Design a protein around this ligand. Structure first.
Ligand SMILES: [Mg+2]
Ligand SMILES: [Mg+2]
Ligand SMILES: [Mg+2]
Ligand SMILES: [Mg+2]
Ligand SMILES: [Mg+2]
Ligand SMILES: [Mg+2]
Ligand SMILES: [Mg+2]
Ligand SMILES: [Mg+2]
Ligand SMILES: [Mg+2]
Ligand SMILES: [Mg+2]
Ligand SMILES: [Mg+2]
Ligand SMILES: [Mg+2]
Ligand SMILES: [Mg+2]
Ligand SMILES: [Mg+2]
Ligand SMILES: [Mg+2]
Ligand SMILES: [Mg+2]
Ligand SMILES: [Mg+2]
Ligand SMILES: [Mg+2]
Ligand SMILES: [Mg+2]
Ligand SMILES: [Mg+2]
Ligand SMILES: [Mg+2]
Ligand SMILES: [Mg+2]
Ligand SMILES: [Mg+2]
Ligand SMILES: [Mg+2]
Ligand SMILES: [Mg+2]
Ligand SMILES: [Mg+2]
Ligand SMILES: [Mg+2]
Ligand SMILES: [Mg+2]
Ligand SMILES: [Mg+2]
Ligand SMILES: [Mg+2]
Ligand SMILES: [Mg+2]
Ligand SMILES: [Mg+2]
Ligand SMILES: [Mg+2]
Ligand SMILES: [Mg+2]
Ligand SMILES: [Mg+2]
Ligand SMILES: [Mg+2]
Ligand SMILES: [Mg+2]
Ligand SMILES: [Mg+2]
Ligand SMILES: [Mg+2]
Ligand SMILES: [Mg+2]
Ligand SMILES: [Mg+2]
Ligand SMILES: [Mg+2]
Ligand SMILES: [Mg+2]
Ligand SMILES: [Mg+2]
Ligand SMILES: [Mg+2]
Ligand SMILES: [Mg+2]
Ligand SMILES: [Mg+2]
Ligand SMILES: [Mg+2]
Ligand SMILES: [Mg+2]
Ligand SMILES: [Mg+2]
Ligand SMILES: [Mg+2]
Ligand SMILES: [Mg+2]
Ligand SMILES: [Mg+2]
Ligand SMILES: [Mg+2]
Ligand SMILES: [Mg+2]
Ligand SMILES: [Mg+2]
Ligand SMILES: [Mg+2]
Ligand SMILES: [Mg+2]
Ligand SMILES: [Mg+2]
Ligand SMILES: [Mg+2]
Ligand SMILES: [Mg+2]
Ligand SMILES: [Mg+2]
Ligand SMILES: [Mg+2]
Ligand SMILES: [Mg+2]
Ligand SMILES: [Mg+2]
Ligand SMILES: [Mg+2]
Ligand SMILES: [Mg+2]
Ligand SMILES: [Mg+2]
Ligand SMILES: [Mg+2]
Ligand SMILES: [Mg+2]
Ligand SMILES: [Mg+2]
Ligand SMILES: [Mg+2]
Ligand SMILES: [Mg+2]
Ligand SMILES: [Mg+2]
Ligand SMILES: [Mg+2]
Ligand SMILES: [Mg+2]
Ligand SMILES: [Mg+2]
Ligand SMILES: [Mg+2]
Ligand SMILES: [Mg+2]
Ligand SMILES: [Mg+2]
Ligand SMILES: [Mg+2]
Ligand SMILES: [Mg+2]
Ligand SMILES: [Mg+2]
Ligand SMILES: [Mg+2]
Ligand SMILES: [Mg+2]
Ligand SMILES: [Mg+2]
Ligand SMILES: [Mg+2]
Ligand SMILES: [Mg+2]
Ligand SMILES: [Mg+2]
Ligand SMILES: [Mg+2]
Ligand SMILES: [Mg+2]
Ligand SMILES: [Mg+2]
Ligand SMILES: [Mg+2]
Ligand SMILES: [Mg+2]
Ligand SMILES: [Mg+2]
Ligand SMILES: [Mg+2]
Ligand SMILES: [Mg+2]
Ligand SMILES: [Mg+2]
Ligand SMILES: [Mg+2]
Ligand SMILES: [Mg+2]
Ligand SMILES: [Mg+2]
Ligand SMILES: [Mg+2]
Ligand SMILES: [Mg+2]
Ligand SMILES: [Mg+2]
Ligand SMILES: [Mg+2]
Ligand SMILES: [Mg+2]
Ligand SMILES: [Mg+2]
Ligand SMILES: [Mg+2]
Ligand SMILES: [Mg+2]
Ligand SMILES: [Mg+2]
Ligand SMILES: [Mg+2]
Ligand SMILES: [Mg+2]
Ligand SMILES: [Mg+2]
Ligand SMILES: [Mg+2]
Ligand SMILES: [Mg+2]
Ligand SMILES: [Mg+2]
Ligand SMILES: [Mg+2]
Ligand SMILES: [Mg+2]
Ligand SMILES: [Mg+2]
Ligand SMILES: [Mg+2]
Ligand SMILES: [Mg+2]
Ligand SMILES: [Mg+2]
Ligand SMILES: [Mg+2]
Ligand SMILES: [Mg+2]
Ligand SMILES: [Mg+2]
Ligand SMILES: [Mg+2]
Ligand SMILES: [Mg+2]
Ligand SMILES: [Mg+2]
Ligand SMILES: [Mg+2]
Ligand SMILES: [Mg+2]
Ligand SMILES: [Mg+2]
Ligand SMILES: [Mg+2]
Ligand SMILES: [Mg+2]
Ligand SMILES: [Mg+2]
Ligand SMILES: [Mg+2]
Ligand SMILES: [Mg+2]
Ligand SMILES: [Mg+2]
Ligand SMILES: [Mg+2]
Ligand SMILES: [Mg+2]
Ligand SMILES: [Mg+2]
Ligand SMILES: [Mg+2]
Ligand SMILES: [Mg+2]
Ligand SMILES: [Mg+2]
Ligand SMILES: [Mg+2]
Ligand SMILES: [Mg+2]
Ligand SMILES: [Mg+2]
Ligand SMILES: [Mg+2]
Ligand SMILES: [Mg+2]
Ligand SMILES: [Mg+2]
Ligand SMILES: [Mg+2]
Ligand SMILES: [Mg+2]
Ligand SMILES: [Mg+2]
Ligand SMILES: [Mg+2]
Ligand SMILES: [Mg+2]
Ligand SMILES: [Mg+2]
Ligand SMILES: [Mg+2]
Ligand SMILES: [Mg+2]
Ligand SMILES: [Mg+2]
Ligand SMILES: [Mg+2]
Ligand SMILES: [Mg+2]
Ligand SMILES: [Mg+2]
Ligand SMILES: [Mg+2]
Ligand SMILES: [Mg+2]
Ligand SMILES: [Mg+2]
Ligand SMILES: [Mg+2]
Ligand SMILES: [Mg+2]
Ligand SMILES: [Mg+2]
Ligand SMILES: [Mg+2]
Ligand SMILES: [Mg+2]
Ligand SMILES: [Mg+2]
Ligand SMILES: [Mg+2]
Ligand SMILES: [Mg+2]
Ligand SMILES: [Mg+2]
Ligand SMILES: [Mg+2]
Ligand SMILES: [Mg+2]
Ligand SMILES: [Mg+2]
Ligand SMILES: [Mg+2]
Ligand SMILES: [Mg+2]
Ligand SMILES: [Mg+2]
Ligand SMILES: [Mg+2]
Ligand SMILES: [Mg+2]
Ligand SMILES: [Mg+2]
Ligand SMILES: [Mg+2]
Ligand SMILES: [Mg+2]
Ligand SMILES: [Mg+2]
Ligand SMILES: [Mg+2]
Ligand SMILES: [Mg+2]
Ligand SMILES: [Mg+2]
Ligand SMILES: [Mg+2]
Ligand SMILES: [Mg+2]
Ligand SMILES: [Mg+2]
Ligand SMILES: [Mg+2]
Ligand SMILES: [Mg+2]
Ligand SMILES: [Mg+2]
Ligand SMILES: [Mg+2]
Ligand SMILES: [Mg+2]
Ligand SMILES: [Mg+2]
Ligand SMILES: [Mg+2]
Ligand SMILES: [Mg+2]
Ligand SMILES: [Mg+2]
Ligand SMILES: [Mg+2]
Ligand SMILES: [Mg+2]
Ligand SMILES: [Mg+2]
Ligand SMILES: [Mg+2]
Ligand SMILES: [Mg+2]
Ligand SMILES: [Mg+2]
Ligand SMILES: [Mg+2]
Ligand SMILES: [Mg+2]
Ligand SMILES: [Mg+2]
Ligand SMILES: [Mg+2]
Ligand SMILES: [Mg+2]
Ligand SMILES: [Mg+2]
Ligand SMILES: [Mg+2]
Ligand SMILES: [Mg+2]
Ligand SMILES: [Mg+2]
Ligand SMILES: [Mg+2]
Ligand SMILES: [Mg+2]
Ligand SMILES: [Mg+2]
Ligand SMILES: [Mg+2]
Ligand SMILES: [Mg+2]
Ligand SMILES: [Mg+2]
Ligand SMILES: [Mg+2]
Ligand SMILES: [Mg+2]
Ligand SMILES: [Mg+2]
Ligand SMILES: [Mg+2]
Ligand SMILES: [Mg+2]
Ligand SMILES: [Mg+2]
Ligand SMILES: [Mg+2]
Ligand SMILES: [Mg+2]
Ligand SMILES: [Mg+2]
Ligand SMILES: [Mg+2]
Ligand SMILES: [Mg+2]
Ligand SMILES: [Mg+2]
Ligand SMILES: [Mg+2]
Ligand SMILES: [Mg+2]
Ligand SMILES: [Mg+2]
Ligand SMILES: [Mg+2]
Ligand SMILES: [Mg+2]
Ligand SMILES: [Mg+2]
Ligand SMILES: [Mg+2]
Ligand SMILES: [Mg+2]
Ligand SMILES: [Mg+2]
Ligand SMILES: [Mg+2]
Ligand SMILES: [Mg+2]
Ligand SMILES: [Mg+2]
Ligand SMILES: [Mg+2]
Ligand SMILES: [Mg+2]
Ligand SMILES: [Mg+2]
Ligand SMILES: [Mg+2]
Ligand SMILES: [Mg+2]
Ligand SMILES: [Mg+2]
Ligand SMILES: [Mg+2]
Ligand SMILES: [Mg+2]
Ligand SMILES: [Mg+2]
Ligand SMILES: [Mg+2]
Ligand SMILES: [Mg+2]
Ligand SMILES: [Mg+2]
Ligand SMILES: [Mg+2]
Ligand SMILES: [Mg+2]
Ligand SMILES: [Mg+2]
Ligand SMILES: [Mg+2]
Ligand SMILES: [Mg+2]
Ligand SMILES: [Mg+2]
Ligand SMILES: [Mg+2]
Ligand SMILES: [Mg+2]
Lengths: 48, 275
RNA sequence: GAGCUAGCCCUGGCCAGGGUGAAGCUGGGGUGAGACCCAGUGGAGGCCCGAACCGGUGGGGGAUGCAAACCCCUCGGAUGA
RNA sequence: GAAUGCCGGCAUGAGUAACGAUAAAGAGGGUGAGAAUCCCUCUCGCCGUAAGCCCAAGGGUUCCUACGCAAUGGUCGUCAGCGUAGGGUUAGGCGGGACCUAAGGUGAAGCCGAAAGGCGUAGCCGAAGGGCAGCCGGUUAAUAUUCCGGCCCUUCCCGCAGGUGCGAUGGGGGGACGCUCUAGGCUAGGGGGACCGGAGCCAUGGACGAGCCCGGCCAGAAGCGCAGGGUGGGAGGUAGGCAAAUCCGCCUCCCAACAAGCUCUGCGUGGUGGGGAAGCCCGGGUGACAACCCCCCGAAGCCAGGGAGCCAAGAAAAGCCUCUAAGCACAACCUGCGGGAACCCGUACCGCAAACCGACACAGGUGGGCGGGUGCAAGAGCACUCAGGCGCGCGGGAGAACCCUCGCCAAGGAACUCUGCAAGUUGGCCCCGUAACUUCGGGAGAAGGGGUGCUCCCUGGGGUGAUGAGCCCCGGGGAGCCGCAGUGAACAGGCUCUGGCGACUGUUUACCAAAAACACAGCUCUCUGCGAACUCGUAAGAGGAGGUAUAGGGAGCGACGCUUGCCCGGUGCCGGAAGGUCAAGGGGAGGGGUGCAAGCCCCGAACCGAAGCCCCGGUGAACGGCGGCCGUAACUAUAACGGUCCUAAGGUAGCGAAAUUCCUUGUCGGGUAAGUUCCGACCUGCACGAAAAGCGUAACGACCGGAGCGCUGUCUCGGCGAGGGACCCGGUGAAAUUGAACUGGCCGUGAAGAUGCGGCCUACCCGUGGCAGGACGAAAAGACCCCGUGGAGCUUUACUGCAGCC
RNA sequence: CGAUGUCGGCUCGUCGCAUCCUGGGGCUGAAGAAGGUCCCAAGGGUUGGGCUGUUCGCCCAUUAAAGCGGCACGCGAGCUG
RNA sequence: UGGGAGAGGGUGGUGGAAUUCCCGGAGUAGCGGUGAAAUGCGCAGAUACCGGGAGGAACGCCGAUGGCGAAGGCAGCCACCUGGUCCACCCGUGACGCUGAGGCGCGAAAGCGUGGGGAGCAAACCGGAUUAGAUACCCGGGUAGUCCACGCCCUAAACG
RNA sequence: CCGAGGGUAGGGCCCGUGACUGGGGCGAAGUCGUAACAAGGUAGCUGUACCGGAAGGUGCGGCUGGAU
């Protein structure tokens, strides 16, 4: 059938992108946490 | 005269459509339409706050001249009678001798080719807008302001009317379409005549489709739901209400009066409504 | 988290083909005028048959599957909610 | 040493199942260490509204080439979407940006919120919508509307010439719009040609032919030609388009109005630039100076912003035009010409799939365009085929049971069975004909029949053209021919009668329920006078609605027809300016503490004191409720009739052994050989009943019953046959499970059902194909049941709070 | 209770005998035929249908007869459901 | 041709009396009702009186034993639209007439549908009385409906 | 070819009969009430509507075939 993952570059960056995270308090804490843990990537890779 | 159809489908059996015998112009006035933005019953938080809304035909909003005290003593001609999908009434297009063009909602008996006028001096004739204090007692009237200069507010649905019962001070006594008696200020404007298209109540939507066309999504009985959804939820099988009939939200839907008791317009409601 | 799913909003798109043949219209009849009658034209419809498309009724298979819901035969809707 | 322990390692099942659509293969010749699997050829089969082609999204080098075969590939591998390396994506015109706005988002003004933050007009952002300038061919191993050739065009700058009141975010016009149906004329595409060009071919009995086979075009600037769209012209007045305004809007007059005039498109032609087959011979070359013409069909695309009808009434903004304001009229704009200038990003390749979503090269999912011919009424259906693309990444045998998918069947014909489940029957078309009932539409494809091929002959209309021929779409008549049989293959209804339930088309438990459930028009009650009620939110603010009682919220009922009875005592709701009860507060008889005293401090009775409750009313399509015993008629039986107890009132109409009836398969009737079901009745209704509606109701239904016809492998009752498996050989090689096992039967015994204990019987060791009685077989720490002072959803006149409202 | 799948059916049997039939008998209110009752006897046999989910039961038409029980109310790693 | 009478019909308008209701004042222990009662209503201020307002229907006197119409039937007043009818004059046509199966139209009340309306009245229904009972007559309430529009129904002691 | 007739399917008319149900007629001495005939103790009849064990009652409109 139709599965759950239907990639969509515009959707990916607009929902999980760096700018979507920076806007909201909970977004920044995300970026702060993943920085504290040391993630190589702070948001999903999406081609644009 | 509302039109019937032969029973050549189950739904055509009872379905009735308006006569449209009064419409003279079949496309609107481009200078007087806006995009009427459909909500779907969703507020600015995006929440369904009014239920069972959405999905109806696309519409343009016809700007309607609900003041008319803009243009005192300027005669306008009735150039057309047009279909408006935003209200039950029909609308009339006014070419003012000014050159200015406006829509008013069309009273009953109004004819393309005649002339209307707004102001304290206007003849007491169908389509003229006057302050309330100058309209003679007893004349039916529509498009009635409720507070001076705040815009026509009452008797704007098709077929409806208001009647000037008496005078008292700076106030006139109106029998609104609901049969209540209220005080409205005399400087409030009102328009001579009832609203046209009374046959509107006699329309039979004939099938569920036309309801969906009007933006009316299917209403679900509370009895049919589950208790997490509604006071009438559940039961094994069908079930009487088994408690005072309640809305989805708890309050009692039978009888329970709901107007504010301390509302300042109480000093101006003379009598609650009828039937 | 609404890239699944539910509903709505904005903007686009899709619906082979055949069948039935509403109103109206014209003529003709009828009449005091009407109603109504007949033929033709007309092409209405949550109309009819049926692909695409949308479904998922019955049965069989499948059952460490081709598949964590599939396959085959059958069947429902297919201009409309 | 056990924790269904944790991490790892390695066993068992086992050389077992399997190796992923039953579209299918065979051979020759290559290559190489090695070949069913790579390359080439010939033959065969498969898709062909796809299984071919072109976009989009997503993927991100996977593309092309050389070089490879450890791993990946379900086998093999010399091959590869794999490994190493090199190469490869070229734009003013294609798409996107330097343009436009949509929902939405954001957000100077502003508003609100303990903080975080929430709002919000403008404006900004935001696209597959609007706007905008490139078509044809050639070329690379791989990019091409991008490179190149040919012919076109756009904007910016600057110059020149001519013209003009120039000038904009300002004003206006325009952009600018639905649905069904649709004309005229074209184009896309297709069919035929006895005409035109072509390498040839003559077979196996005939044919040297009006024979066969192939092909007969594409793009094109201005002019012109055909077809369309858009479009009044002038004048005077003018108070409106938030300044202005010759524009626009409004009024008056002459004028031009099926016209035309102008302009804008499509189509054709068009200098010119290309293309060009089979076949033959190494993608090449030839063919070839290739020819490139005629007739027909003909779009759903184009002209287009076309026409008509309809109701549910069908975006915005920019471009573009027009108007003027500051300004400036040495400027500026317009037209024409010339030169110059013209940026960023994407472009490989896959793309119904082995490259995307599904952990897999996974029978699943994925939006748009093109989708050729013949025949079958039509069609994108079906069969077969073109172009093109494939044979599905294990094979070779054998020809058991059994399994799946499939074909047939003597006689019977539902006897099968929970049920004709399933499978038959029927099957398109044309014609004849067609019932109850009905809301007059329908029921209807009702039912049931006849026809259907081919040849010859005679003919009616329609389309093109010309009014003829030809082509072409519908027919009609007559005489015939063949077969078992002419929708000869493929696609393509079984019918009926009768109940129940729901009016109907719709909707639903994604992944066990499609239903009688939801919904539905329609009916009623109730709330709401607008800063509405109601909803969401702390609020601001939103929705409601830019709506106004013919409207909007809530609730039940559920088309329609005929209907909808009695009870307001209780609960609710509604009304009630009295009475009663009632908090804070007021009031202050009177006491209390303390101080030498003024004082300070405390307690405090009467009485005034809202809402709510009490009380008085109303109210049922508000929550609900609608009796018991005894007796009585001149056969009996039974009670129209009476007696009395109780109630707030004792169930009306209609219906009833029912989707409800317990006794129950009630009784009687019909159907049947036989009928716990069915239908029709009766009425002692355990326990129908009137908008949780009551009784009906045409039509509808993948709903649930009962009967009949047809026809059958469902059955008596099975038989044979087909292929895919199972089986055997070569290759790859899992799984749950598993205390260890050297694991028989009986009768006993044992924690009460023993391979394992006792006694007896039986039994050489080890396999293979099979079947399932046991291993209280396996997967699952029973979901039933109970227990836990475990949990959660839900309820209410349980308790206690809180939101909200008063 | 870290699961012993539960009605009925179908399929496949097998066992018991307190015997439905068939075979041998005694007694009889056994004349014959035909029965009744009891004794021996498990070898074999013990049908097809309508109703119901039914086991059962009732019925139809037959029959030599239309036996009754056990086998985890035999039998779902055999099917149905 | 010229006149006359008439509630003949249709539409729109509009006048006053009375009833109920609402509002203000004023006023108090009962009103109402019957054969007598009671239900009912009234100190939460009724009845009785004054002023005010809304709404409906029906039109007193005139009114008659009258008029009109085909019958059903039609009654405040105004205007519009329209039928019949009668009379005078003796002008016109020249038997054009009578009836009338069928057909068509009209047709009290009640009733039916869809809107509206709703004062008073009132089937049904409820209550109080009466009675052996009283599903009645009598009393207090009261829903259709009576009324408007359109469309049905087509009955009658539709009678002279 | 026509053709008695036979078969298949679907209609229309008629008759008989059917559990049960609807009223109707008639039947020496049943039960209930008293509706009508007098003002029949509510004048009565009437068309219609609703209602009630039954006769009847009530509403509406009409008739006199009504009385004083
Ligand atoms: Mg899905
Ligand atoms: Mg996944
Ligand atoms: Mg998707
Ligand atoms: Mg995207
Ligand atoms: Mg995108
Ligand atoms: Mg997106
Ligand atoms: Mg973002
Ligand atoms: Mg976001
Ligand atoms: Mg911070
Ligand atoms: Mg890093
Ligand atoms: Mg990571
Ligand atoms: Mg992140
Ligand atoms: Mg209709
Ligand atoms: Mg009709
Ligand atoms: Mg109209
Ligand atoms: Mg605009
Ligand atoms: Mg809005
Ligand atoms: Mg918003
Ligand atoms: Mg938001
Ligand atoms: Mg949110
Ligand atoms: Mg709501
Ligand atoms: Mg909504
Ligand atoms: Mg309108
Ligand atoms: Mg409205
Ligand atoms: Mg006011
Ligand atoms: Mg309505
Ligand atoms: Mg609408
Ligand atoms: Mg509903
Ligand atoms: Mg429910
Ligand atoms: Mg439920
Ligand atoms: Mg919830
Ligand atoms: Mg809750
Ligand atoms: Mg609740
Ligand atoms: Mg409930
Ligand atoms: Mg339920
Ligand atoms: Mg129940
Ligand atoms: Mg329920
Ligand atoms: Mg109820
Ligand atoms: Mg209850
Ligand atoms: Mg409640
Ligand atoms: Mg509330
Ligand atoms: Mg009111
Ligand atoms: Mg989130
Ligand atoms: Mg669309
Ligand atoms: Mg379609
Ligand atoms: Mg037809
Ligand atoms: Mg026709
Ligand atoms: Mg027409
Ligand atoms: Mg349809
Ligand atoms: Mg059909
Ligand atoms: Mg299925
Ligand atoms: Mg089947
Ligand atoms: Mg499964
Ligand atoms: Mg499938
Ligand atoms: Mg199929
Ligand atoms: Mg449908
Ligand atoms: Mg269909
Ligand atoms: Mg269709
Ligand atoms: Mg739609
Ligand atoms: Mg231990
Ligand atoms: Mg553990
Ligand atoms: Mg361990
Ligand atoms: Mg472990
Ligand atoms: Mg582990
Ligand atoms: Mg391990
Ligand atoms: Mg390790
Ligand atoms: Mg290992
Ligand atoms: Mg091994
Ligand atoms: Mg094995
Ligand atoms: Mg396996
Ligand atoms: Mg195998
Ligand atoms: Mg497999
Ligand atoms: Mg297949
Ligand atoms: Mg197959
Ligand atoms: Mg070969
Ligand atoms: Mg081979
Ligand atoms: Mg190989
Ligand atoms: Mg090899
Ligand atoms: Mg192969
Ligand atoms: Mg090869
Ligand atoms: Mg060969
Ligand atoms: Mg094809
Ligand atoms: Mg990938
Ligand atoms: Mg390898
Ligand atoms: Mg290898
Ligand atoms: Mg290597
Ligand atoms: Mg491998
Ligand atoms: Mg390998
Ligand atoms: Mg594989
Ligand atoms: Mg090699
Ligand atoms: Mg490349
Ligand atoms: Mg170019
Ligand atoms: Mg720049
Ligand atoms: Mg913060
Ligand atoms: Mg954005
Ligand atoms: Mg933008
Ligand atoms: Mg765009
Ligand atoms: Mg472009
Ligand atoms: Mg070009
Ligand atoms: Mg090209
Ligand atoms: Mg090269
Ligand atoms: Mg110059
Ligand atoms: Mg100029
Ligand atoms: Mg200018
Ligand atoms: Mg426009
Ligand atoms: Mg617009
Ligand atoms: Mg558009
Ligand atoms: Mg429409
Ligand atoms: Mg062309
Ligand atoms: Mg063709
Ligand atoms: Mg050309
Ligand atoms: Mg001028
Ligand atoms: Mg001016
Ligand atoms: Mg050459
Ligand atoms: Mg199309
Ligand atoms: Mg167009
Ligand atoms: Mg906008
Ligand atoms: Mg100046
Ligand atoms: Mg100058
Ligand atoms: Mg730049
Ligand atoms: Mg490219
Ligand atoms: Mg596919
Ligand atoms: Mg591929
Ligand atoms: Mg492909
Ligand atoms: Mg892959
Ligand atoms: Mg594969
Ligand atoms: Mg695949
Ligand atoms: Mg072709
Ligand atoms: Mg066909
Ligand atoms: Mg294959
Ligand atoms: Mg395939
Ligand atoms: Mg394979
Ligand atoms: Mg073998
Ligand atoms: Mg044969
Ligand atoms: Mg057979
Ligand atoms: Mg048979
Ligand atoms: Mg037969
Ligand atoms: Mg049967
Ligand atoms: Mg079943
Ligand atoms: Mg068949
Ligand atoms: Mg067929
Ligand atoms: Mg029949
Ligand atoms: Mg018929
Ligand atoms: Mg029938
Ligand atoms: Mg019927
Ligand atoms: Mg009919
Ligand atoms: Mg037929
Ligand atoms: Mg032949
Ligand atoms: Mg069919
Ligand atoms: Mg249904
Ligand atoms: Mg249902
Ligand atoms: Mg119904
Ligand atoms: Mg329904
Ligand atoms: Mg489900
Ligand atoms: Mg489920
Ligand atoms: Mg699930
Ligand atoms: Mg299912
Ligand atoms: Mg269900
Ligand atoms: Mg269904
Ligand atoms: Mg449902
Ligand atoms: Mg429902
Ligand atoms: Mg209804
Ligand atoms: Mg109502
Ligand atoms: Mg709230
Ligand atoms: Mg706060
Ligand atoms: Mg709004
Ligand atoms: Mg219904
Ligand atoms: Mg319901
Ligand atoms: Mg009560
Ligand atoms: Mg009460
Ligand atoms: Mg009460
Ligand atoms: Mg109080
Ligand atoms: Mg109760
Ligand atoms: Mg109860
Ligand atoms: Mg009743
Ligand atoms: Mg029963
Ligand atoms: Mg019964
Ligand atoms: Mg029965
Ligand atoms: Mg029943
Ligand atoms: Mg019951
Ligand atoms: Mg029973
Ligand atoms: Mg029985
Ligand atoms: Mg019988
Ligand atoms: Mg029955
Ligand atoms: Mg009985
Ligand atoms: Mg119920
Ligand atoms: Mg009820
Ligand atoms: Mg029924
Ligand atoms: Mg029915
Ligand atoms: Mg029916
Ligand atoms: Mg259905
Ligand atoms: Mg169904
Ligand atoms: Mg059945
Ligand atoms: Mg049957
Ligand atoms: Mg049969
Ligand atoms: Mg068989
Ligand atoms: Mg075989
Ligand atoms: Mg061997
Ligand atoms: Mg091997
Ligand atoms: Mg391997
Ligand atoms: Mg051991
Ligand atoms: Mg051992
Ligand atoms: Mg052993
Ligand atoms: Mg052994
Ligand atoms: Mg024991
Ligand atoms: Mg034992
Ligand atoms: Mg042993
Ligand atoms: Mg031992
Ligand atoms: Mg021992
Ligand atoms: Mg032993
Ligand atoms: Mg032993
Ligand atoms: Mg032994
Ligand atoms: Mg073996
Ligand atoms: Mg085996
Ligand atoms: Mg076993
Ligand atoms: Mg077994
Ligand atoms: Mg076992
Ligand atoms: Mg065990
Ligand atoms: Mg077992
Ligand atoms: Mg186990
Ligand atoms: Mg499990
Ligand atoms: Mg556990
Ligand atoms: Mg546990
Ligand atoms: Mg447990
Ligand atoms: Mg468990
Ligand atoms: Mg227990
Ligand atoms: Mg406790
Ligand atoms: Mg305890
Ligand atoms: Mg607990
Ligand atoms: Mg809890
Ligand atoms: Mg257990
Ligand atoms: Mg276990
Ligand atoms: Mg277990
Ligand atoms: Mg069987
Ligand atoms: Mg013997
Ligand atoms: Mg004897
Ligand atoms: Mg003897
Ligand atoms: Mg024996
Ligand atoms: Mg049985
Ligand atoms: Mg049993
Ligand atoms: Mg039984
Ligand atoms: Mg015998
Ligand atoms: Mg016998
Ligand atoms: Mg037994
Ligand atoms: Mg036992
Ligand atoms: Mg037992
Ligand atoms: Mg038992
Ligand atoms: Mg099983
Ligand atoms: Mg079983
Ligand atoms: Mg087992
Ligand atoms: Mg007092
Ligand atoms: Mg009123
Ligand atoms: Mg004379
Ligand atoms: Mg009448
Ligand atoms: Mg009447
Ligand atoms: Mg009483
Ligand atoms: Mg007495
Ligand atoms: Mg004959
Ligand atoms: Mg014969
Ligand atoms: Mg006596
Ligand atoms: Mg009487
Ligand atoms: Mg009497
Ligand atoms: Mg009398
Ligand atoms: Mg009397
Ligand atoms: Mg009465």
């Amino acid at each position: 059938m139709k599965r759950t993952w239907q990639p969509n570059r515009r959707k990916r960056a607009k929902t999980h992108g760096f700018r979507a995270r920076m806007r909201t308090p909970g977004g920044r804490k995300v970026l702060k946490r993943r920085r504290q843990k040391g993630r190589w990537r702070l948001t999903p890779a999406v081609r644009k | 005269a509302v039109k019937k159809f032969k029973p050549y489908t189950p739904s055509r059996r009872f379905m009735t459509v308006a006569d449209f015998s009064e419409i003279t112009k079949t496309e609107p006035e481009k200078s007087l339409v806006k995009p009427l933005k459909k909500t779907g019953g969703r507020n600015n938080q995006g929440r369904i706050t009014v239920r069972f809304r959405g999905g109806g035909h696309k519409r343009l909003y016809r700007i309607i001249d609900f003041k008319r005290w803009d243009k005192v003593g300027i005669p306008a001609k009735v150039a057309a009678i047009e279909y408006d999908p935003n209200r039950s009434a029909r609308i009339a297009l006014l070419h003012y001798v000014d050159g200015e063009k406006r829509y008013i909602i069309a009273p009953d008996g109004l004819q393309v080719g005649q002339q209307v006028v707004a102001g304290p001096d206007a003849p007491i004739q169908v389509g003229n807008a006057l302050p309330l204090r100058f309209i003679p007692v007893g004349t039916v009237v529509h498009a009635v302001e409720l507070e001076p200069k705040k815009g026509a507010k009452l008797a704007r649905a098709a077929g409806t009317s208001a009647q000037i019962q008496g005078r008292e001070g700076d106030y006139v006594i109106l029998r609104l379409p609901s049969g209540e008696l209220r005080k409205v200020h005399g400087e409030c404007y009102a328009t001579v005549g009832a609203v046209g298209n009374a046959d509107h109540k006699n329309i039979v939507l004939g099938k569920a489709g036309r309801s969906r066309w009007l933006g009316r999504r299917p209403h679900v009985r509370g009895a049919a739901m589950n208790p997490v959804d509604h006071p009438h939820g559940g039961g094994e099988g069908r079930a009487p209400r088994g408690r005072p009939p309640a809305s989805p939200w708890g309050w009692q839907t039978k009888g329970l009066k709901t107007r504010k008791r301390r509302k300042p317009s109480s000093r101006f409601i003379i009598a609650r409504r009828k039937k």
